[PDB]
């Protein structure tokens, strides 16, 4: 399991990296844009925020396969081992094949269907990123798409990994993980919810009270 | 997973070969007929349209096992590594056994039943092609036949492959792939649908607009 | 069950009306555009092609609720008992509410999600038309959407009817009918595949042979 | 099915009331407080924003059953037909019983468990509102709780209705409706997602474009 | 649904009676012993603990049908409308028949098996009380016995009611109610757990905190 | 639910008829033979030992339909309201049709499959008796046969009743009852096991022990 | 998968042996008898008619184990590597154990139950032959018996093989193959049906017509 | 799969051992009692009845761990390699641990629950013997228990074997085997039913008849 | 399987360690507080109570990751090989990473959700302990959580073990074991119920009575 945060918030990443067992950070264009720092600024910052380890992801912007390959080369010049996200469109598929021939690792993103995602993996993508919540919002089942995609990769491209993305609630992430997703990337709010629970807090408070009641202190 | 296109449209194969990760092109007698070019023309053209690589399939026309085997020999003289499609009839089965002895790889085609398919695999066919949409159109369940056939091959002829064929909608293709089909062949309309999604276009445009608003350009 | 054809082909409708037990004809803006005849010609012609009986459907075009209400009155002035199709968008939902209050029967169309469809029924629509094959083409499940939607109407709008539409294969129509759709509209190709079967024709021919054989003719 | 908005945003309620077939508006202490207008201001504003019809909900703040009854009366004096939301705690249950005896309609809220919910209905509550996303966020299954609660009400308190609440994604709302909830309240973002889809916009645009292109007209 | 407490703790019954919508109190010989007061003292006290209303249950001690009937009469002379609990043994069944002839309502108790329970109802028992937790503790499935019992009664003795008893956790109680039990009796510890939740208390507190933040207090 | 004993043990019927709520007694040739008394002796005695009220069943011996109607008349001359058991064989089915025309009630017995059983109900039998254990013993599923038969009667002969017979263990009886059998006949050993349980006896003794510990006596 | 024909029709076997991939021919005493040729005549004729290779099966007639052993030796002296079919009776079981000691391969035949079949494998039978259609015809489920048997062998006698037999329709053979049977033997009529399909013939005819239409011939 | 007879009937064991593939014989205190011969007489006779091979089981009678160990040594002094059956009680568990330290193989018997069974395997028992029919007779599911137990040993004590015991009907035996029991012990009645079937006898008779008609004799 | 007692009752641990096959003892702050002895007294005692063998667990009290690590070192200086329980909160997760780096084995405790559990394992916890009964009590499903948790560890952290804890009834423990938990800790009451069954005692009693009746004593 590779656990990622889906963010460009460098400060939050450094703070959460001591808490969570993080494999890295994923970004996309909207997330980069929301943070306002350019790629060649934020990427190295995010790399530093995890102590110079872990895996980063960032997305091409060009519209033609050749442009996307050139984006990829730029991105790799910024972080030498970065994984390059390519949206799974006709040209994106073409770019994924060309990038496979160049030894540049890719992830097929903006995946709204299982077959589509599979095709990215067959073209060479190492990761495929279905947009779970988007699919849920638009009247589908993100979980079924994921389940299906995961089945397809397991049968048809077993070195490729699902990187489940787009979350509004912890339950979605849980269901992706239950479906066997080898990787997942969480926005900050959902990640925080996943480790903070009133029932857990009440259990700890209770241990503290019982311990006080018998020993006159709450410390060991 | 071997992905094929089911077409005799040479220009289209040239264009789509850079997009899709194609293992090759399949043809059948109707598909050749629709293209109007003879086999000894269209086949080499198809081979060159995939840059001199990949696998082709073409179908015998004779009615007797002996004729089918001569048909096979002619097809091989056109494309040396072609896989010969034989309809899974009585004579077809005999032809498949004969061609197995000769080392000419075959596909058992026009399969409308699971046991029928299995018989072609036991007789020697490397591939078995159920006609998914014809089974659906004629009041059956193409997906159930594909599921049953796959189970049968996996248990009883584990080196034979299902090459699902005959599609009107991506959902059929998806379901064949979810059933574990090792290979598949798509007509051009369904292949195009499988990589074109309004929800994907909208996601990519939103990325473009957010990037424009933050950085004043749409390039990286 | 109300069985419709999805066509503006008057000649085909007349010929097929003596074979199928039709409840009428559905049109939509592209179907009408293809046929090149304006509505005030095609609609009465379709009405006539079914001997003055049956039910018709045609779609509004305007972008605003007010516009769509005016489109509906115009449609009603061409065919007085026509059911007006309204796309299930925000403005369309507003139009459906207004049309309910004016006693003008509506169908909620362009339905790609269950909840969307349910909303059109709760706003007053008498029919809800999911686009089965489009949902299938775009990596969803047409059949699950139809099932979900039908369950939603039966629980929460029990007098509203599903009118399943958008078909590439008889299997989609069969599954919609098995799911309990109260109505359905078939394009001409799917409708004709629904009544033509090689096995049936073989059975009938065998009957003829055996009769010839015992009686010296194929007639009674 | 009764459809509510979960909001204190008067301008948004008025705008959306012409689109959706709304039964009313629900509020709770957090929603009221984010709007900053006090109850004696917002509630009549919300009532008017729906043309003085439909149903309203608001929540008691007191911690004692006696206080809760007194808060009910304050609420009823602002809106004579309001439904009073009572959290389902020990004191809340006691208060629901007292309110039942006074003929003041209640809703048992802050429901995180099915049996808890049932108790509130058995005590007299007309609606039971499980917090769907809260249960999902905290490592449960909000849908399973709704399913269970709905089953329990149907068997044991058949005149009580589930009013499903707490949504981050349309999929949650869909699953609540499929589970048979008689009522539901949506925050505005989920409601807007529920009627806005790229695939639907693409379908409608294609009709528009095909229409003018047969008929140079943007309507009928 | 009839809700009982399973207890001889009069003060507790009084307190809990304002909170829960109680139908009454059940007792058994161990619960009477543990409270130390004899029946002619506690039953009237428990009756008064509920404002002279609701239903009470108490168990016969005799070994023979005859003795069990005389135990019943002594119980009825203490509380005129008490329901008499008879263990479902051979003599218990004989006793239930006799008591039915006398018009004295019974409950078949100490039920460890579904068919056993069914026999008690067919003999005239108005209620049947499977010992859910004891079945669980002894290597069976309390919930399945309950489920089987309820099916049997619904098919074969539809006016007979299940009264589920013997609980160490709310989950068992929940499962019984999900299975359709028409009545249930909870020990005090389980009942208290059924209305007290860390997550519910956290939700109330957050309401208070936001109300404070916007209005300068925690009251309406 | 009609509960029968499957026996010719007059003394045992007397005793057990006060414990169980019997509908009456079934016999068959092997059960009569084993008790050694002729039909004209036991049948009257069994009629009296179930306290003069209930149904009796006994079986014909002839091998032709005509002979079977004669046996039916002889049995009726012993017990005028007796139900006549006819083995469901070809001659038996013929006899069942005759007896139906004569207004003499039948039970189609020696039923080892579901369709066989249904045929007897279509011919006129009021009861159908599958031999459950016998089907189990000979490598089938008695419970599945009963389930299928019950289904068939319910759909196809809804006034006919299953009378499940042939039991070696209570589980078999329980499963027959779960499957909705309207009636059942138990041999004495299985009946006795159905009301005798060590866990039940231990609950009662615990109650006597706790009672006497608190009160110094065992009586109420 | 070993595919056998269930026949003594030597001429038919010669014909079908070039079409099907046969492992062999099974016989039994009714099949031999129906052919009129004694064993020492037909068994060598069948050995030839396959092509001189493969596996033969013939059944013992004796009634004691010792005589079945002498039947085994007689059969073996006609065809040295014949597999001896022994009915799974008590004496057949005893014969199977002796034959195992003597190293003569057996098949346990006339199996109507799964446990019975299992016992034959635990005794030493290499093959176990349930009679599928006999089980179906007699009110059981031949498919369930085969499925159960195959499970029993797989867990408890994994080197023994189900040889599914007794068929009236291809569907029975399909379900046996789908249940995982390692071998199967078909009567000639069911085998012919398994490779002859109106739908397949119709598909080949259409290819021929389309090819004719484009190239003016029906040859390649 | 180890197949055992549950019996102290020496003569029957000798006869049955030539029919069944027996692993040995199991006894318990009741089966020894019923045969009336003491342990030092029957155990050697049963051994010799299997020609001095296979495995024997006998049960301890003492009531404490220490006394059970002494009994184990007494049994071992009668038959040097006997498997000692220890009832799975608190003291029995302790005994099982000691006997493991002393290298004497044990069977955990009198098992009525899956977890209890498991504890006996965890304590050192090689076999665990659930009393299937006793669980059935007492209102449980012997089969669910066996399934659960087999699951537990497979996960948590994989060298330990289930030895299913206590049968009144072949079906129970069949279901134990389908649930994967490594061993089983049958009473002589059940065992005999497991090899005797009317349908099988009818099939063998039909073979004889057909043989007679073709060849004028019933031998080979 | 590792079997633990959840207790600080030294005497009970000594006595139960001769009955159960214990892997050790678990403690938590409430269990330590209830036994009233400080850690440096009970932990050594508990260790001795198991003959100086097996594994122990004890829980940190501090609120910061750093405090928690310091608590870990204190616990390790009392028992060198102890496993340190760390509540799975944000700080607990950070502590678990640190302890992993220091090579001190941990258990992630106070687990109320499956994802929370998995995070503790991904951070390096060797054991994960969901509070089964607390989840049950608070309206969830402890078994579903355990099941989900176990699936996550198996797919994503296969070296981590579920240590199921918090039990009010043996059924919960059974279901945890059936879900595949590698380890489990039982409170004393539940452990005792797991080895004491009235049905088992009656089976033993019966064996003694049959032995007496045959041999005149109850001993061997």
UniProtKB/Swiss-Prot annotation, chains A, B, C, D, E, F, G, H, I:
EC numbers: 4.1.2.-
Active-site residues annotated for this sequence: 85 (schiff-base intermediate with substrate)
Disulfide bridges in this chain: none
Principal cellular location given in the protein's record: cytoplasm
Entries under PROSITE patterns matching the protein: TRANSALDOLASE_1, TRANSALDOLASE_2
CDD domains: Transaldolase_FSA (cd00956)
Keyword line: Carbohydrate metabolism, Cytoplasm, Lyase, Schiff base
Top-level taxon of origin: Bacteria
Entry's pH dependence statement: Optimum pH is about 8.5. Active from pH 6 to 12.
Temperature notes for this entry: Displays a broad temperature optimum and is active in the range from 20 to 75 degrees Celsius. Although no significant loss of activity is detected after 600 hours of incubation at 45 degrees Celsius (at pH 8.0), the respective half-lives of the enzyme are 200 hours at 55 degrees Celsius, 30 hours at 65 degrees Celsius, and 16 hours at 75 degrees Celsius.
Keyword hit for Iron: no
Cellular compartments annotated: Cytoplasm
Gene Ontology CC entries for this record: cytoplasm
One Pfam match: TAL_FSA
Leading EC class: lyase
Miscellaneous: Is not inhibited by EDTA which points to a metal-independent mode of action.
Listed PANTHER family: FRUCTOSE-6-PHOSPHATE ALDOLASE 1-RELATED, TRANSALDOLASE
Subunit record text: Homodecamer. Five subunits are arranged as a pentamer, and two ring-like pentamers pack like a donut to form the decamer.
Name of the protein: Fructose-6-phosphate aldolase 1
Organism whose genome encodes this protein: Escherichia coli (strain K12)
